Amino acid sequence: PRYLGLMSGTSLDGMDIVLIEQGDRTTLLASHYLPMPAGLREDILALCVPGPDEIARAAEVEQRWVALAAQGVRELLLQQQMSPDEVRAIGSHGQTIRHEPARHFTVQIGNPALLAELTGIDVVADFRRRDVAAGGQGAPLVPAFHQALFGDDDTSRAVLNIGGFSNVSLLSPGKPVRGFDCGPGNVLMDAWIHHQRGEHFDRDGAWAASGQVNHALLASLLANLPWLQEHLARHPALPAADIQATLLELSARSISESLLDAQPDCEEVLVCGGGAFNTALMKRLAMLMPEARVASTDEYGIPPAWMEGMAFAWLAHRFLERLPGNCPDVTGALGPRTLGALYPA
Amino acid sequence: PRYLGLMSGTSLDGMDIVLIEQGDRTTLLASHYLPMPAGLREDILALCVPGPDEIARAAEVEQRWVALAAQGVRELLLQQQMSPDEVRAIGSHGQTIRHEPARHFTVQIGNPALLAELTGIDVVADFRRRDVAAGGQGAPLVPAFHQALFGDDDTSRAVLNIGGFSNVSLLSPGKPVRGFDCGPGNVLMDAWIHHQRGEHFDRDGAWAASGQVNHALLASLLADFNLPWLQEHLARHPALPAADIQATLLELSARSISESLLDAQPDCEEVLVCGGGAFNTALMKRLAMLMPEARVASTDEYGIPPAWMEGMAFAWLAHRFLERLPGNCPDVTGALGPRTLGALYPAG
Ligand SMILES: Nc1ncnc2c1ncn2[C@@H]1O[C@H](COP(=O)(O)OP(=O)(O)CP(=O)(O)O)[C@@H](O)[C@H]1O
């Protein structure tokens, strides 16, 4: 069946809306991004810390959030010339305004009843609360999706997300799913090329690849921008591209070492997040993990930029299939649980 | 199938827990009442008006609320020798802490995911939000249940709920379901007998029945609800026996109810009374005298115990959800049309 997934993370720049086809495999049919208006962003941020009149404020803020979400859903469907009747459900994360599992609560707003009213599509939402009710942290959610996609190959695999920072899901046969942070991802390379060339990032890692790794600098680094700038002053003036090359090597070494310490027999590293598009970084990771095949998740039909939205569409599917949606090995929950709640159209 | 219903009103005394069998008819199998501790009542009340730190406070309060609800479900099932697997779903009203349909929102707490986790039973909850989303007031919800129970091809009926206050569902054949608020129910009689005798309420209305209606006082009251409000009225009248005041308060409710009811439905053939007021023998007697063309009787005579009507409505709403049948009455709520109400939190 077909599902929409709706995600809006804590950066509040906009909403990711994806449309998947789900059967034996998960396939991305379409995707859409909708920027969040400045006014909505502030009112949400103002709810992310304790303040007065929160019940009423959150109730009114979520109405605006839902209207925007419904607009985005309508827009994606229009683009695909698809009737909402062709979609089984929307999996909506909502918007986190408070997440405090130590006090046994997590709060995502996003009035799913209104989302169903406006879209005419069944909504599955409120995915974190059941994991928390069962003693979990209510996060992370995506490793369950990683496991369903890539687990059970009888193969030791790592699903590596390279965003600003790096994190990995380890899928080892006969072992619990594991998850941990690997180190910096794109954060410094982005910071360095922005500072030096006004680029948001290093496309294909081409700037890094044109430079030459400085081993003195690399050694200092291994033993943010001001943090980096502090290091560069302690060396003669280095070409900016050599700096970039050294920053790439820094990420490649930190990721590969963290991964291999936890899963030395890793056979495949599947890379998602924007770092999967960094050709130079991907090449170096492969060199540093010579017993593992390193490839983008794209090679498996999962576009690396859309992992999160697709996970939420998938969670809608899991709910309706009466299958568990959490990964208690990573959330700390007592066991597998059905995640979410159904608000029918 | 079998369903649990969980009701907790704005009076904040306790939770109604009911077990029904639902097929062509709705039948009460078992019921349970669980008092709410003062500390929880106080903390809930404090969330009913705007205040500080509400998100975190509500989250902590609802966890205690859910723990109590789950124990109540457990006890009912223990008494009935029933496993949670024998229950199809719980329909939970939750606890209302803010209701402002004019601002298009209504808020019931009661973490349904936690309720499903603790009970091991599928939970259907959050019934008001879809009605509000469709432009309605999100209330009242019970008239749709009243309709399913008592709506008939040939009888003008009024289903009258007498709690602290009174509200009625008008069921006219070939006509839309109607609903409205009929005035005070037990609120003043309860306050007056508590003040004068330290009783929680006037059992069978016997104290009121021992008194005599004062027509001057009745006329003043009707020319207009709490104890200071009454004391202010008593100040404008000579000193009356306490029982006469109680008798006059009963007559106030009886006349206000009958007059609103008869004005809206002059051809009323049956008044079916539920809520605790149905147990007030003296009040029931006066309602019957004031509506002589209608048969005035407890819902018990129609197979629905009057104390458990509201809880049973929420059990019924869980059934309506699972059957994808509408749960609201848009003519009474003002919603755009019929809607499936609620959200499913599966036990899994
Ligand atoms: N045996 C009896 N004799 C007389 N009155 C009785 C009674 N049993 C119950 N009552 C009355 O019923 C009242 C409770 O009414 P009910 O239970 O229907 O209200 P409720 O629990 O729904 C709260 P609300 O007032 O918000 O509706 C008591 O306060 C009392 O006045």
Short mmCIF file of N, CA and C in Angstrom, two decimals, chain B residues 28-138:
data_model
loop_
_atom_site.label_atom_id
_atom_site.label_comp_id
_atom_site.label_asym_id
_atom_site.label_seq_id
_atom_site.Cartn_x
_atom_site.Cartn_y
_atom_site.Cartn_z
N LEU B 28 -25.55 -3.53 30.51
CA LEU B 28 -24.54 -3.38 31.55
C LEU B 28 -24.28 -4.72 32.19
N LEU B 29 -23.02 -5.14 32.17
CA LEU B 29 -22.62 -6.39 32.82
C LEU B 29 -22.09 -6.18 34.24
N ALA B 30 -21.37 -5.09 34.45
CA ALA B 30 -20.74 -4.83 35.73
C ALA B 30 -20.38 -3.37 35.80
N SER B 31 -20.19 -2.86 37.01
CA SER B 31 -19.83 -1.47 37.18
C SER B 31 -18.94 -1.30 38.40
N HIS B 32 -18.18 -0.22 38.41
CA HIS B 32 -17.25 0.03 39.49
C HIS B 32 -17.07 1.52 39.64
N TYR B 33 -17.05 1.99 40.88
CA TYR B 33 -16.77 3.39 41.14
C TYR B 33 -15.52 3.47 41.99
N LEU B 34 -14.62 4.37 41.62
CA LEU B 34 -13.36 4.50 42.33
C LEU B 34 -13.19 5.97 42.67
N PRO B 35 -13.11 6.29 43.97
CA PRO B 35 -12.95 7.70 44.37
C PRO B 35 -11.60 8.26 43.94
N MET B 36 -11.56 9.56 43.68
CA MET B 36 -10.30 10.21 43.37
C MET B 36 -9.76 10.87 44.64
N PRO B 37 -8.49 10.58 44.98
CA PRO B 37 -7.84 11.20 46.15
C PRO B 37 -7.85 12.72 46.05
N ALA B 38 -7.97 13.39 47.19
CA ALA B 38 -8.01 14.85 47.23
C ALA B 38 -6.83 15.50 46.53
N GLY B 39 -5.64 14.93 46.71
CA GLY B 39 -4.45 15.49 46.10
C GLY B 39 -4.54 15.52 44.58
N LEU B 40 -5.06 14.46 43.98
CA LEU B 40 -5.24 14.38 42.54
C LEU B 40 -6.33 15.34 42.07
N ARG B 41 -7.42 15.40 42.82
CA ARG B 41 -8.52 16.32 42.53
C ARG B 41 -8.04 17.77 42.52
N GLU B 42 -7.24 18.12 43.53
CA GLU B 42 -6.69 19.46 43.65
C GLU B 42 -5.76 19.80 42.48
N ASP B 43 -4.90 18.85 42.11
CA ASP B 43 -3.93 19.06 41.04
C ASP B 43 -4.60 19.15 39.66
N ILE B 44 -5.68 18.41 39.48
CA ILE B 44 -6.46 18.49 38.25
C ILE B 44 -7.17 19.83 38.12
N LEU B 45 -7.83 20.23 39.20
CA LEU B 45 -8.55 21.49 39.28
C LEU B 45 -7.64 22.66 38.95
N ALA B 46 -6.40 22.59 39.44
CA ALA B 46 -5.39 23.62 39.18
C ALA B 46 -4.99 23.73 37.71
N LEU B 47 -5.30 22.70 36.91
CA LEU B 47 -5.02 22.74 35.48
C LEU B 47 -6.20 23.22 34.65
N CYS B 48 -7.32 23.49 35.31
CA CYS B 48 -8.54 23.85 34.60
C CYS B 48 -8.63 25.34 34.27
N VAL B 49 -7.67 26.10 34.77
CA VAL B 49 -7.54 27.51 34.44
C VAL B 49 -6.09 27.74 34.05
N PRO B 50 -5.83 28.75 33.20
CA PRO B 50 -4.45 28.98 32.77
C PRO B 50 -3.50 29.18 33.94
N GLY B 51 -2.33 28.56 33.84
CA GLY B 51 -1.35 28.60 34.91
C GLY B 51 0.04 28.30 34.39
N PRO B 52 1.01 28.23 35.31
CA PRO B 52 2.41 28.01 34.94
C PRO B 52 2.74 26.54 34.68
N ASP B 53 3.73 26.28 33.83
CA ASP B 53 4.34 24.95 33.72
C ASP B 53 3.32 23.86 33.40
N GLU B 54 2.32 24.19 32.58
CA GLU B 54 1.19 23.29 32.36
C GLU B 54 1.52 21.97 31.65
N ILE B 55 2.39 22.00 30.65
CA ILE B 55 2.74 20.78 29.91
C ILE B 55 3.32 19.70 30.83
N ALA B 56 4.32 20.07 31.61
CA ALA B 56 4.93 19.13 32.54
C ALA B 56 3.98 18.71 33.66
N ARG B 57 3.24 19.67 34.21
CA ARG B 57 2.29 19.38 35.29
C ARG B 57 1.20 18.41 34.84
N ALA B 58 0.65 18.64 33.65
CA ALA B 58 -0.41 17.78 33.13
C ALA B 58 0.08 16.37 32.87
N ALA B 59 1.32 16.26 32.41
CA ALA B 59 1.92 14.96 32.13
C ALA B 59 2.10 14.13 33.40
N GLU B 60 2.46 14.78 34.50
CA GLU B 60 2.64 14.07 35.75
C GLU B 60 1.28 13.67 36.33
N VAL B 61 0.32 14.59 36.25
CA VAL B 61 -1.02 14.35 36.78
C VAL B 61 -1.73 13.23 36.03
N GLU B 62 -1.57 13.20 34.71
CA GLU B 62 -2.26 12.19 33.91
C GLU B 62 -1.68 10.79 34.17
N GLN B 63 -0.41 10.71 34.53
CA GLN B 63 0.17 9.42 34.89
C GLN B 63 -0.47 8.83 36.15
N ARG B 64 -0.77 9.69 37.13
CA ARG B 64 -1.46 9.25 38.34
C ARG B 64 -2.91 8.89 38.04
N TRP B 65 -3.54 9.69 37.18
CA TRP B 65 -4.91 9.44 36.73
C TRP B 65 -5.00 8.09 36.05
N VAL B 66 -4.06 7.81 35.16
CA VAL B 66 -4.06 6.55 34.43
C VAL B 66 -3.81 5.35 35.35
N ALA B 67 -2.91 5.51 36.31
CA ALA B 67 -2.66 4.45 37.26
C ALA B 67 -3.94 4.10 38.03
N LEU B 68 -4.69 5.11 38.45
CA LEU B 68 -5.95 4.87 39.15
C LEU B 68 -6.98 4.18 38.25
N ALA B 69 -7.12 4.67 37.02
CA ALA B 69 -8.05 4.06 36.07
C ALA B 69 -7.73 2.59 35.82
N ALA B 70 -6.44 2.30 35.66
CA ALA B 70 -6.03 0.93 35.42
C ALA B 70 -6.32 0.00 36.61
N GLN B 71 -6.13 0.49 37.82
CA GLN B 71 -6.46 -0.33 38.99
C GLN B 71 -7.96 -0.60 39.02
N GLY B 72 -8.76 0.41 38.67
CA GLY B 72 -10.21 0.24 38.66
C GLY B 72 -10.66 -0.80 37.66
N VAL B 73 -10.08 -0.75 36.47
CA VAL B 73 -10.35 -1.76 35.45
C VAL B 73 -9.97 -3.15 35.99
N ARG B 74 -8.79 -3.23 36.58
CA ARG B 74 -8.31 -4.47 37.16
C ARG B 74 -9.29 -5.04 38.19
N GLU B 75 -9.77 -4.18 39.08
CA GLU B 75 -10.69 -4.64 40.12
C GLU B 75 -12.02 -5.12 39.55
N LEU B 76 -12.54 -4.41 38.55
CA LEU B 76 -13.80 -4.83 37.94
C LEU B 76 -13.63 -6.20 37.30
N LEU B 77 -12.52 -6.38 36.59
CA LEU B 77 -12.25 -7.65 35.92
C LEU B 77 -12.03 -8.76 36.95
N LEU B 78 -11.35 -8.45 38.05
CA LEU B 78 -11.23 -9.43 39.14
C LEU B 78 -12.60 -9.87 39.65
N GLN B 79 -13.48 -8.92 39.92
CA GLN B 79 -14.80 -9.28 40.40
C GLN B 79 -15.59 -10.12 39.41
N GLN B 80 -15.40 -9.84 38.12
CA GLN B 80 -16.15 -10.53 37.08
C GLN B 80 -15.49 -11.82 36.60
N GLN B 81 -14.35 -12.16 37.19
CA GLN B 81 -13.56 -13.31 36.74
C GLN B 81 -13.32 -13.25 35.24
N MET B 82 -12.89 -12.08 34.77
CA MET B 82 -12.66 -11.84 33.35
C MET B 82 -11.19 -11.48 33.13
N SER B 83 -10.63 -11.99 32.04
CA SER B 83 -9.28 -11.63 31.63
C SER B 83 -9.37 -10.42 30.71
N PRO B 84 -8.33 -9.56 30.72
CA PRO B 84 -8.38 -8.42 29.80
C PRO B 84 -8.53 -8.86 28.35
N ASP B 85 -8.10 -10.07 28.00
CA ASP B 85 -8.26 -10.56 26.63
C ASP B 85 -9.73 -10.72 26.21
N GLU B 86 -10.63 -10.73 27.19
CA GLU B 86 -12.05 -10.94 26.92
C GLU B 86 -12.75 -9.60 26.63
N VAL B 87 -12.00 -8.51 26.78
CA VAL B 87 -12.55 -7.18 26.56
C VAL B 87 -12.06 -6.68 25.23
N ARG B 88 -12.97 -6.24 24.37
CA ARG B 88 -12.54 -5.78 23.05
C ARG B 88 -11.77 -4.47 23.11
N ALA B 89 -12.27 -3.53 23.90
CA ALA B 89 -11.62 -2.23 24.04
C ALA B 89 -12.17 -1.49 25.24
N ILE B 90 -11.40 -0.52 25.72
CA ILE B 90 -11.86 0.45 26.68
C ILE B 90 -12.11 1.76 25.96
N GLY B 91 -13.29 2.34 26.18
CA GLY B 91 -13.57 3.68 25.71
C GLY B 91 -13.37 4.63 26.86
N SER B 92 -12.37 5.49 26.73
CA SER B 92 -12.01 6.40 27.82
C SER B 92 -12.34 7.86 27.50
N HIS B 93 -13.12 8.46 28.38
CA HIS B 93 -13.45 9.88 28.34
C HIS B 93 -12.22 10.74 28.63
N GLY B 94 -11.31 10.22 29.43
CA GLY B 94 -10.18 11.00 29.92
C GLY B 94 -10.65 12.03 30.94
N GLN B 95 -9.83 13.05 31.18
CA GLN B 95 -10.18 14.10 32.12
C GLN B 95 -10.05 15.45 31.42
N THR B 96 -11.15 16.19 31.34
CA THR B 96 -11.13 17.50 30.70
C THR B 96 -10.45 18.53 31.59
N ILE B 97 -9.40 19.18 31.07
CA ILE B 97 -8.75 20.28 31.79
C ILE B 97 -8.93 21.64 31.10
N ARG B 98 -9.42 21.63 29.87
CA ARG B 98 -9.74 22.87 29.18
C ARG B 98 -10.68 22.54 28.03
N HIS B 99 -11.75 23.33 27.91
CA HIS B 99 -12.73 23.10 26.87
C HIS B 99 -13.16 24.43 26.29
N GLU B 100 -12.62 24.76 25.12
CA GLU B 100 -12.86 26.06 24.51
C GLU B 100 -13.11 25.94 23.02
N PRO B 101 -14.25 25.34 22.64
CA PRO B 101 -14.58 25.12 21.23
C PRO B 101 -14.67 26.44 20.46
N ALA B 102 -14.94 27.53 21.16
CA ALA B 102 -14.92 28.85 20.54
C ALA B 102 -13.52 29.18 20.01
N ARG B 103 -12.49 28.64 20.65
CA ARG B 103 -11.12 28.75 20.15
C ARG B 103 -10.70 27.44 19.47
N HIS B 104 -11.69 26.60 19.16
CA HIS B 104 -11.48 25.36 18.40
C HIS B 104 -10.53 24.37 19.04
N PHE B 105 -10.59 24.25 20.36
CA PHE B 105 -9.81 23.23 21.04
C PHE B 105 -10.50 22.67 22.27
N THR B 106 -10.21 21.41 22.57
CA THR B 106 -10.68 20.76 23.77
C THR B 106 -9.60 19.81 24.22
N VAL B 107 -9.34 19.76 25.52
CA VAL B 107 -8.19 19.03 26.02
C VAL B 107 -8.57 18.06 27.11
N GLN B 108 -8.46 16.77 26.80
CA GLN B 108 -8.66 15.73 27.79
C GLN B 108 -7.33 15.02 28.00
N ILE B 109 -6.91 14.92 29.26
CA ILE B 109 -5.70 14.18 29.56
C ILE B 109 -6.08 12.77 29.96
N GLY B 110 -5.09 11.89 30.07
CA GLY B 110 -5.34 10.52 30.46
C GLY B 110 -4.56 9.54 29.62
N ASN B 111 -3.33 9.93 29.26
CA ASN B 111 -2.38 9.15 28.45
C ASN B 111 -2.87 7.76 28.04
N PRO B 112 -3.56 7.69 26.91
CA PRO B 112 -4.18 6.44 26.46
C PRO B 112 -3.16 5.35 26.13
N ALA B 113 -1.95 5.74 25.73
CA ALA B 113 -0.91 4.76 25.47
C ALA B 113 -0.52 4.08 26.76
N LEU B 114 -0.41 4.87 27.82
CA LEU B 114 -0.09 4.30 29.13
C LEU B 114 -1.25 3.44 29.61
N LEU B 115 -2.48 3.87 29.34
CA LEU B 115 -3.64 3.08 29.77
C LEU B 115 -3.65 1.72 29.07
N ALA B 116 -3.32 1.70 27.78
CA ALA B 116 -3.21 0.43 27.05
C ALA B 116 -2.07 -0.43 27.60
N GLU B 117 -0.93 0.19 27.89
CA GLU B 117 0.20 -0.51 28.48
C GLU B 117 -0.17 -1.17 29.82
N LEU B 118 -0.84 -0.42 30.69
CA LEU B 118 -1.14 -0.95 32.04
C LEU B 118 -2.30 -1.95 32.07
N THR B 119 -3.28 -1.77 31.19
CA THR B 119 -4.48 -2.62 31.22
C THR B 119 -4.37 -3.85 30.33
N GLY B 120 -3.56 -3.75 29.28
CA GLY B 120 -3.45 -4.82 28.29
C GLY B 120 -4.66 -4.89 27.37
N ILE B 121 -5.42 -3.80 27.32
CA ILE B 121 -6.61 -3.76 26.48
C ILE B 121 -6.51 -2.59 25.51
N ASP B 122 -6.97 -2.77 24.27
CA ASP B 122 -7.03 -1.66 23.32
C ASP B 122 -7.82 -0.50 23.91
N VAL B 123 -7.31 0.71 23.73
CA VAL B 123 -7.99 1.89 24.25
C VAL B 123 -8.45 2.80 23.11
N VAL B 124 -9.72 3.19 23.15
CA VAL B 124 -10.19 4.25 22.26
C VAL B 124 -10.45 5.47 23.13
N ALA B 125 -9.85 6.60 22.75
CA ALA B 125 -9.92 7.81 23.56
C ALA B 125 -9.96 9.04 22.66
N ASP B 126 -9.89 10.22 23.28
CA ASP B 126 -9.83 11.48 22.54
C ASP B 126 -11.04 11.67 21.64
N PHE B 127 -12.23 11.43 22.19
CA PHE B 127 -13.45 11.42 21.39
C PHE B 127 -13.92 12.80 20.95
N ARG B 128 -13.58 13.83 21.70
CA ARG B 128 -14.14 15.16 21.40
C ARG B 128 -13.41 15.85 20.25
N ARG B 129 -12.13 15.55 20.07
CA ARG B 129 -11.32 16.34 19.14
C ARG B 129 -11.76 16.29 17.67
N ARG B 130 -12.27 15.17 17.19
CA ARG B 130 -12.72 15.15 15.80
C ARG B 130 -13.97 15.99 15.60
N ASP B 131 -14.85 16.01 16.60
CA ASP B 131 -16.05 16.81 16.49
C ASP B 131 -15.69 18.29 16.42
N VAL B 132 -14.76 18.71 17.27
CA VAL B 132 -14.28 20.09 17.26
C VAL B 132 -13.58 20.40 15.94
N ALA B 133 -12.79 19.44 15.46
CA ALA B 133 -12.10 19.61 14.18
C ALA B 133 -13.08 19.83 13.04
N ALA B 134 -14.28 19.28 13.18
CA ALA B 134 -15.32 19.45 12.17
C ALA B 134 -16.26 20.62 12.48
N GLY B 135 -15.80 21.54 13.32
CA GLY B 135 -16.53 22.77 13.59
C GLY B 135 -17.53 22.68 14.71
N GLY B 136 -17.57 21.55 15.41
CA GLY B 136 -18.51 21.36 16.50
C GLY B 136 -18.01 21.82 17.86
N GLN B 137 -18.87 21.71 18.87
CA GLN B 137 -18.54 22.09 20.24
C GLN B 137 -17.84 20.97 21.00
N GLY B 138 -17.81 19.78 20.41
CA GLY B 138 -17.18 18.63 21.04
C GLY B 138 -17.99 18.10 22.21
#
